[PDB]
Amino acid sequence: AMSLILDDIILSLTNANERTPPQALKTTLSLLYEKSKQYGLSSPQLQALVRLLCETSIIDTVTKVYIVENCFLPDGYLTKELLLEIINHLGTPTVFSRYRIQTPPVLQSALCKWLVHVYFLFPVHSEREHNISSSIWLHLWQFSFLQKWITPLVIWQATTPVDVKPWKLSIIKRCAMHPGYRDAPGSATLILQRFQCLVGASSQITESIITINCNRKTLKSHRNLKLDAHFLSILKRILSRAHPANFPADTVQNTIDMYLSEIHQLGADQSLPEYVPSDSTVSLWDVTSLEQLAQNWPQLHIPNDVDYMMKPRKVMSRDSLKHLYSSIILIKNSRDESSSPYEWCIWQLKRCFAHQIETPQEVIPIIISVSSMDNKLSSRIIQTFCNLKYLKLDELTLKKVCGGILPLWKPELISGTREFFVKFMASIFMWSTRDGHDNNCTFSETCFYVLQMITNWVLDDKLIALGLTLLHDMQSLLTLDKIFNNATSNRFSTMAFISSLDILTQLSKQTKSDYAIQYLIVGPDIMNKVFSSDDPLLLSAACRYLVATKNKLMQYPSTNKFVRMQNQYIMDLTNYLYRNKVLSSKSLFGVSPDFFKQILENLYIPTADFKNAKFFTITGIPALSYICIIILRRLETAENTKIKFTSGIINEETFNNFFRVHHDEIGQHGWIKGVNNIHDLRVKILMHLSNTANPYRDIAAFLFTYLKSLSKY
Amino acid sequence: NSSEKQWERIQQLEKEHVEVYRELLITLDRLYLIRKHNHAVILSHTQQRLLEIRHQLQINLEKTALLIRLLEKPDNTNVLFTKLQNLLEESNSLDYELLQSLGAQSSLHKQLIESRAERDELMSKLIELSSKFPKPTIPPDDSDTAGKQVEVEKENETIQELMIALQIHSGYTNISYTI
Amino acid sequence: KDVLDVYIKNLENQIGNKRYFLKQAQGAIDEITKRSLDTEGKPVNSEVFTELLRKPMFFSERADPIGFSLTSNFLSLRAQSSSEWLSLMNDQSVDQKAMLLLQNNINSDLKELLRKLQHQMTIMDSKKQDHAHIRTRKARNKELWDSLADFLKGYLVPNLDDNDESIDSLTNEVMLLMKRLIEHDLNLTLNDFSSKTIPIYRLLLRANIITVIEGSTNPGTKYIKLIDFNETSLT
Amino acid sequence: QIMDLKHLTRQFLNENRIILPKQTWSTIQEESLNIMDFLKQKIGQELVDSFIDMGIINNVDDMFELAHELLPLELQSRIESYLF
Amino acid sequence: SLDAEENKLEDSSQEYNKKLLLACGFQAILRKILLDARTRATAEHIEAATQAFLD
């Protein structure tokens, strides 16, 4: 549309020959002025325009340089056929071309300056066209007039230290020590400083630098590359408007400033060639942006610098895609057990376990990043390193791998993985709880990672039967007396268990899934031991599991194996938390009810008013004995009482003392509003416990939903 | 700090005391069976677990008597009471941070699994697209006395640089990148 | 300071008493088994286990501080390990937060790459000229010699001393000069450049591409030598 | 005629000896003056023959060599297309 | 540069070429004088070249 109008304007400028119009040419030039600053002079139009400017001489050099400055605003990437039409017009007449009409050297310097300004728009050269361009621009650097502006081109293109061949230095130095250049030392020195950064010390370079010395003034005057900011602003506008998400203003500015910063920083401070066979094989390192990666995709060439592409971003630099390198390598060649990132990651792990590396903390995230998001590799790291062999070597590194790899891993063959992980976790349990090595959260953390893997599995069917079996095989390990205890408990294991007990809670809450309730009821072996434990938040997790599993057992009849033990858990966890009648009932936690009666003999307690009923409630159980006192002393502050309950424990004895020593006020006021009987206090602290701010909300919720006495909340 | 060495010795002694207590309980409950029977020491897992549950019940009943004979009438002057209140208020302080840390650890997992689902749906499309592209053929990979291969690789490079120079410095508008 | 001191003494005494009880019980078990060493004795328990779960053993004394040992060995090991668990889950929840941003920008870039590859596939397989120049080392050299000869035949020869074209002999002389240059004749002199092909010398000289240093044996001739485009030195 | 004079002969000086910079440059400036006047007198292409008369160059190939060593590349070409 | 010396000559294509040739000749004369001074110095001041340049 508009591009057709611009093509017509350029064709009007082209065919404007043999007519010599007085002012029609001026109107065409103004039309070009106003239409090139709007859309952006697509690259074939730029080629036709530079050809018109260099060949024809209808307009003088003043306006030609002016329209090179203010109209050459590309909207795209500068196809490689435009750079040639510029190179083909740079130079001077010679014995061999004495008839060819010369283009004004001022116009040639203007073209080289424009090339410097839009250098971030150069196309990626095909690893041999680059070797030819980096010599064309060096031979064009010998003409003095376009030498101030070809210097940035030789500097920016001189990446890849292979491009620092000494035959270049023989030409750089030869032009610096030359009488009639007047600006060569301050450019040759910049080119040599760039070459120096690229290839290290290189005594030749540093002995050539102090031979053509610039006096620190006409070297700084040459480092400071002054790119026209108005031109670049219009160019950023045109690019962003013409190609969203491809040359946005921020990345274009970051790129221009990166190039200028290279030229500035100059003064402050790669395996082997392999016979590039084809003329069009864009290397991978050279690819700067994503559009260039996609344009040169069928011709891409991934070199064997794996140790470089793996080991250690808005700019459109050559390293802008170093994070995509490993991703666009498994794509080119399909993921083949012989890819470069796979083998690299595996070898780096093998050299991280055997401590043959300096900083594992720097290469381990690089392995987890490439393997956690790739199943074919995440499935071989598990077969190789997830065993006891590599656990005694380094357990601190295997834990990180299991914490990055296992959380996301679905097996390809359901069959042989349950046995594999049972063996793995049993080996970890034996190695972690061995003699002399008490515990350091190796099994509980790895078990935790496995729990996360089991959640991942369970979330998607066809694995929910394998997942829920590994879940119970993990619960049968996280509840062993050596690691899950009542006296020496090491809360690690009681904290990777409440996560397993929540895998189940989330399952039992959701509907529309096929899994027998055999996989949802934990079993009186492990479950009884969770109830008789001592920490409050594990008991809260058990109560949350028990309350969010009834809607899955209503459907089943009463004479069921799993609705009889599930109703047994609640039959006793309710007379162990609220209605303390463990002596009249039978078999509280599988243990007979006269075991407690005999324990309460020789168990010394100073008072004996209400002894057998003193410690079996939510206020007296060693798990929630002090939390209830804290809830009481917090209700006292929330009500601003004036009696301030004078002890910490709540039981039938101390409550009667507190109510007989302050009978006058308790009746009148000064204490918890509704509290008149001990059960009033136990219901008040329960209601305060069921406010969703403390981790023990689920105990109150369970008592409320199952007791049938305080169901009114 | 005399009292700090005192309390460190107390903690060591209490750990030792608890180890000995649990071991004595287990061995007494084994000796009872060994006396009732003659050699039966292979009680099943569902019974080895009942023994552990009963020991836990006994331990809970043992350390809830302390919260009575020492907390029911708060002395606020004994060296033991002042230790308990400095020990009963420290344990459950992190019970909210810890619970939260599991909700923010199974929330990052929810995002990791969706990021990996996206990766697996992208990489397959990408590999199919890569396969559908026309792969460029490889040259005839011959090996002619690799010394000569090198002596030709550097002989057809001086021709390239000579061509570039003769083209740039003389004339010949049609330079190009294909030398 | 002394109340605590007698408390530690009582604790020592009670640990000693319990260890003595343990030793005596293990001795009894050991002796009863030595009365029945028949063969690695391990039969099932004939449901007298149900009688063990009816009555406890080892009733504690009044001075027994085990009510405080259990509470304190457990209430301290629980606040000391929960902090370690918090640190472990908070240094793992920063690794995951970093990996998530990384793997999310990677996925965004892969999505764009897929979009662009679909576009290239749509615009590619109609007549896009995918005819590269794959050549072996010797075929590359052959094509380069042919391109050099065509450059001398087409542009370099016809524009050089073109009084009368007679290009065949002239082009053969120019090509022989180029051959002696490329192959490092080490004996090429300015005298081998006839008054016809002397602009060749000026073109090789202005390009800063040769070295015309004297042979050091004859001060009249100056041996021309091509700059070594192949030598890769320290720089 | 001071710094430009120092610059023009840097390639010639840095190869044999550095400098004896005492009263020479002014003696070099008066010589520049009189040599320029003498060259203008002499000129007041054959020009190459009048050159050969004083410069030991002896021919035009040495004049082009001097041009290649003294002028830049865009003038070396210009001088070649005029001498030959 | 050599343009400095070319401009220090007058103080036109064919005239421009003649001026460039004259500047190159002047620079060659100065370099010959300095080389004669160097030879004079090896013998043992630049005046030994200026007086010898009476040609």
- DSSP per-residue letters across A613-679: TTSSSTTTSTTTHHHHHHHHHHHHHHHT-SS---SS--SHHHHHHHHHSSHHHHHHSSS-SS-SSHH
DSSP letters for A179-201: GGGSSSHHHHHHHHHHHHHHH--
Closest CB to A203: pick one of C85, C227, C234: C234
CB B20 within 8 A of CB C18: yes
Flag whether residue A480 sits within 8 Å of chain C, measured between CB atoms.
no
Measured distance CA(A126)–CA(C6) in Å, rounded: 87
Contacts for A551-557 with beta carbons within 8 Å, 24 or more apart? A551/A508, A551/A509, A552/A508, A552/A517, A552/A520, A553/A517, A556/A517
Range of the domain at A650: 574-713
- Separation CA A676–CA A365 (nearest Å): 61
Tokens of C111: 């999505």
Q: Cα–Cα distance between A654 and A657 in angstroms, integer?
A: 5
Interface test with C, best of B8, B72, B110, B162 (most C CBs within 10 A): B162
R_g (Cα) of chain C, nearest Å: 49
- What are the C-alpha distances in Å from A398 to residues A30, A263, A349, A372, B81? 70, 45, 9, 14, 44
User: How many H helices and E strands in chain A?
Assistant: 35, 0
Q: Which of A633, A660, A665, A670 is nearest to A649 (CA)?
A: A633
**B12, C11 contact by CB (below 8 A):** no
Closest CB from A84, A327, A485 relative to B176:
A84
D82 — contact with chain C (CB < 8 Å)? no
* Residue B103 to residues A80, A305, A691, C71, Cα–Cα distance (Å): 55, 42, 18, 29
Query: What is the distance in angstroms between the Cα of D5 and the nearest Cα belonging to chain A?
Result: 10
How many residue pairs from chains A and D have C-beta atoms closer than 8 A? 44
Query: For residue A698, which of A507, A550, A547, A571 has the smallest C-alpha distance?
Result: A547
C216, with CB counted inside 10 A (0-12, 13-18, 19+), is exposed
| Calpha distance D5→D2 (Å, rounded) | 5
Bridge partners (DSSP) of residue C222 are: C214
Are C224 and C188 spatial neighbours (Cβ–Cβ below 8 Å)?
A: yes
Whether residue E55 lies inside any domain: the answer is: no
Please give the Cα distance from A513 to A214 (Å, whole number): 79
Neighbours of A51 (CB within 10 A): 16
B48 SS3 class: helix
Tell me the Cα Rg of chain B: 41
Q: How far apart are CA C210 and CA C94, in angstroms?
A: 62
* Same-domain check for residues A1 and A16: yes
Q: By C-alpha distance, which of A304, A399, A394 is closest to A343?
A: A304
- Determine contact: E21 vs chain A, CB below 8 A: no
Give whole-number Cα distances, A251 to A239, A244, A317, in Å: 11, 12, 10
Contact E22, E9 (CB under 8 A): yes
Helix (H, G, I), strand (E, B) or coil at A233: helix
Count up the domains in chain E and report the number. 1
For chain E, give the residues followed by a break (C–N over 2.5 Å): 11, 44
Under an 8 A CB cutoff, do D67 and E35 touch? no
**Rounded-to-integer distance, Cα A67 and Cα A475, Å:** 78
- Is the backbone of residue C77 left (phi > 0), alpha (psi -120 to 50) or beta? alpha
Q: Which of A66, A90, A123 is the last residue of a domain?
A: A123
Query: What is the rounded end-to-end Cα distance, in angstroms, of chain C?
Result: 78
Helix (DSSP H) and strand (DSSP E) numbers for chain D: 6, 0
What's the Cα-to-Cα distance from B82 to each of A112, A139, B71, B74, B78, rounded to whole Å? 84, 89, 10, 9, 6
Q: Is D22 left (phi over 0), alpha (psi -120 to 50) or beta?
A: beta
Both tokens assigned to A611 = 């002894």
Q: What is the CA radius of gyration of chain D?
A: 15
DSSP A435-448: TT----SSHHHHHH
Q: Which of A547, A600, A557 is nearest to A577 (CA)?
A: A547
Phi, psi of C222 (to 5 degrees): -130, 115
Sign of CA dihedral A244, A246, A251, A253: negative
E-state strands within A180-291: none
- The whole-angstrom separation of Cα C147 and Cα B24 is 98
Looking at the complex, report in whole angstroms how far the Cα of residue C203 sits from the nearest Cα belonging to chain D.
9
In D, which residues are within 8 Å of C198 by CB distance?
84
- What dihedral do alpha carbons A541, A544, A546, A547 form, nearest 10°? 170
Nearest one of A184, A191, A193 to A144, comparing CA atoms: A184
The minimum CA-CA distance between D42 and chain A, rounded to whole Å, is 25
Which domain, by its residues, includes E21?
Answer: 2-50
Q: Which chains touch B (3 or more CB pairs under 8 A)?
A: A, C
Selected residues 639-678 of chain A with any CB under 8 Å from a CB in chain B: 646-649, 651, 653-654
Total of domains in chain A? 4
Taking an 8 Å cut-off on Cβ atoms, the answer to whether C205 and D68 are in contact is yes
Contacts (Cβ under 8 Å, ≥6 apart) of B123: A327, A330, A331, A335, A374, C110
Three-state DSSP state, C189? strand
User: Could you tell me which residues of chain A have a Cβ less than 8 Å from any Cβ in chain E?
Assistant: 179-182
- A139 and C CB contact within 8 Å: yes
- Listed in sequence order, the residues at least 6 apart from E44 whose beta carbon sits closer than 8 Å to its beta carbon are none
Instruction: List the single residue in B with minimal CA-CA distance to C41.
Output: B39
Contact A602 C78 (CB under 8 A): no
Q: Are A211 and A177 in contact (CB under 8 A)?
A: yes
Q: What is the DSSP string of A525-591?
A: HHHHHHHT---HHHHHHHHHHHHTTSTTTSSS-SS-HHHHHHHHHHHHHSTTTTS--TTTSS-SSSS
**Cβ(A549)–Cβ(A527) under 8 Å?**
no
Own/partner pairs, A268-272, CB within 8 angstroms, 24+ separation: A269/A197, A270/A160, A270/A161, A270/A162, A270/A305, A270/A308, A271/A303, A271/A304, A271/A305, A271/A308
Residue E3 forms contact with A (CB below 8 Å): yes
Same domain, D53 and D68: yes
Q: Say yes or no: C120 contacts chain A, CB-CB below 8 A.
A: yes
Cβ(A144)–Cβ(A182) below 8 Å: yes
Q: For an interface test with E, which of A145, A147, A182 has the most E Cβ atoms less than 10 Å from its Cβ?
A: A182
Range of the structural domain that residue D60 is part of:
45-84
For residues A136-167, b (16+ Cβ closer than 10 Å) or e, as one string? Answer: bbbbbbbbbbbbbbbbbbbbbbbbbeebbbbb
Instruction: Report phi then psi at A283, rounded to 5.
Output: -60, 170
Put simply, the chain A residues between 314 and 353 with a CB less than 8 A from any chain B CB are 327, 330-332, 334-335
The dihedral sign for the CA sequence A333, A337, A340, A341: positive
Structure tokens at C195: 């008054």
Cα A31 to Cα A10: distance, rounded to the nearest angstrom: 10
Instruction: Provide, as residue numbers in chain E, all residues whose Cβ is less than 8 Å from the Cβ of A181.
Output: 1
CA of E22: which chain D residue's CA is closest? D39
In chain D, the residue whose alpha carbon lies closest to the alpha carbon of A181 is D72
Q: Do B34 and C32 touch (CB under 8 A)?
A: yes
CA distance A465 to A467: 5
Helix (H) or strand (E) holding C230: none
Query: Does residue C231 sit in helix, strand or coil?
Result: coil
Q: For residues B19-49, b (16+ Cβ closer than 10 Å) or e, as one string? A: bbbbebbbbbbbbbbbeebebbeebeeebeb
Residue A97 DSSP label = G
Number of H helices, E strands in chain B: 8, 0
Rounded to a whole number of angstroms, the CA Rg of chain A reads 40
Question: For residues A577 and A590, is the Cβ–Cβ distance under 8 A?
Answer: no
CB atoms within 10 A of CB C179: 12
Q: Is A333 helix (H, G, I), strand (E, B) or coil?
A: coil
Give the closest of B2, B142, B156 to C144, CB-based.
B156
Resolution in angstroms comes to: 3.2
Comparing CB atoms, the residue among A95, A105, A143 nearest residue D80 is A95
Residue D22 and residue D50 in one domain? no
List of residues 6+ apart from A711 with CB closer than 8 A? A704, A705
* Token digits of residue A527: 């479950």
In the numeric block, the tokens 């690691």 are attached to: A483
Using a 10 angstrom Cβ sphere, with 0-12 exposed, 13-18 middle and 19 or more buried, the burial of residue A476 is: middle
CA gap C232, D3 in Å, rounded: 37
Residue bearing tokens 């079993």: A523
Q: What gap in Å lies between CA A5 and CA A11, rounded to an integer?
A: 10
Rounded to the nearest angstrom, the minimum Cα separation between A552 and chain B is: 24
Among A401, A407, A145, A57, CA closest to B107: A407
Strand partners, A283: A301
Token couple for C13: 């005494």
Same domain, D38 and D1: yes
Touching chains A and E? (3+ Cβ pairs < 8 A): yes
Secondary structure letter of residue B136 according to DSSP:
P
* Interface residue of A525, A576, A630, A691 to substitute, partner B, most B CBs within 10 Å: A525
Integer angstrom CA distances of residue A512 from A125, A454, A501, A507: 57, 19, 20, 10
Residue A164 near chain C (CB below 8 Å):
yes
| CB within 8 Å of C210: residues ≥ 6 apart | C181, C204, C224, C225, C226, C227
Quick one: which of D75, A391, A389, A277 has its CA closest to E24? D75
**Residues D54, D34 within the same domain:** no
Work out the widest C-alpha separation in chain A, in whole angstroms. 126
Residue A156 to residue A261: CA distance in whole angstroms: 11
Chain E residues with CB under 8 Å of a chain D CB are 1-2, 4-5, 8-9, 14, 17-18, 20-35, 38, 41, 45-47, 50, 55
- Distance from A621 to chain B by nearest Cα, in Å? 7
According to the 3-state scheme, what is the secondary structure of A70-84? HCCCCCCCCCHHHHH
Note whether A417 and A307 are same-domain residues.
no
Sign of the torsion formed by the C-alpha atoms of C124, C128, C130 and C133: negative
Residues in chain B: 179
Both D40 and D9 in one domain: the answer is: yes
Neighbours of A6 (CB within 10 A): 21
Q: Where are the domains of chain C?
A: 138-226
Structure tokens at A207: 């002995």
Residues D34 and D56 in one domain: no
d(CA A463, CA A469): 10
CB contact under 8 A, A92 and D77: yes
* C-chain residues near A294 (CB < 8 A): 113, 116-117, 119-120
Alpha-carbon distance A279 to nearest alpha carbon in chain C (angstroms): 5
The encoded tokens of residue A123 equal: 């196309």
CA atoms within 13 A on the CB side of B165: 25
The set of long-range contacts for A230-234, using a CB threshold of 8 Å and a minimum separation of 24, is A231/A69, A231/A70, A231/A73, A231/A117, A232/A117, A232/A256, A234/A37, A234/A73
The residue written with tokens 């209430």 in the block is: C75
Looking at the structure, tell me whether residues A530 and A624 fall in a common domain: no
CA distance A370 to A373: 6
Query: D68 to chain C nearest CA, in Å?
Result: 7
Q: Do B177 and A84 touch (CB under 8 A)?
A: yes
Q: Does A618 lie in the same domain as A689?
A: yes
Residues A474 and A446 sit within 8 Å (Cβ to Cβ) = no
According to DSSP, residue C155 is labeled: I
Q: What angle do CA A157, A159, A165 make, to 5 degrees?
A: 95
Judged on CB neighbours under 10 Å (0-12, 13-18, 19+), A713 is exposed
Mutate to test the interface with E, among D20, D71, D84 (most CBs of E within 10 A): D71
Does the distance separating the beta carbons of B98 and A87 come in below 8 Å?
A: no
Q: How far apart are the first and last CA of chain D?
A: 33
Q: What angle do CA A345, A281, A309 make, to 5 degrees?
A: 20
Q: Which two tokens stand for residue C209?
A: 């591409």
A243: left (phi over 0), alpha (psi -120 to 50) or beta: beta
Cβ distance of B173 and A647 shorter than 8 Å? no
Q: Is residue A394 part of a domain?
A: yes
Are B53 and A136 in contact (CB < 8 Å)?
Answer: no
Angstrom distance (rounded) from CA A46 to CA A51: 8
**Amino acid, single-letter form, for residue D64:** F
Beta-carbon-side half-sphere exposure of residue C214 (alpha carbons within 13 Å): 6
Q: How far apart are CA B50 and CA C45, in angstroms?
A: 14
Distance to chain E for A202, nearest Cα, Å: 30
- Inter-chain CB pairs, B–C, below 8 Å: 297
Please indicate, yes or no, if residue A388 is contained in any of the structural domains: yes
Q: List the single best residue of C3, C31, C69 to mutate versus B (max B Cβ within 10 A).
A: C69
H/E run at residue C210: strand C210-211
Give the CB-side neighbour count of residue A390, counting CA atoms within 13 A.
22
Q: Are C68 and B66 in contact (CB under 8 A)?
A: yes
User: How far apart are alpha carbons A67 and A65 in whole angstroms?
Assistant: 6
Chain C contacts in chain D segment 31-60 (CB below 8 A): none
What's the residue count for chain A? 713
Physical contact, C and E (3 or more Cβ pairs within 8 A): no
If we measure between CA atoms, which residue out of A113, A102, A181, A105 comes closest to residue A149?
Answer: A113
Examine the domain organization and report whether D49 and D29 are in the same domain: no
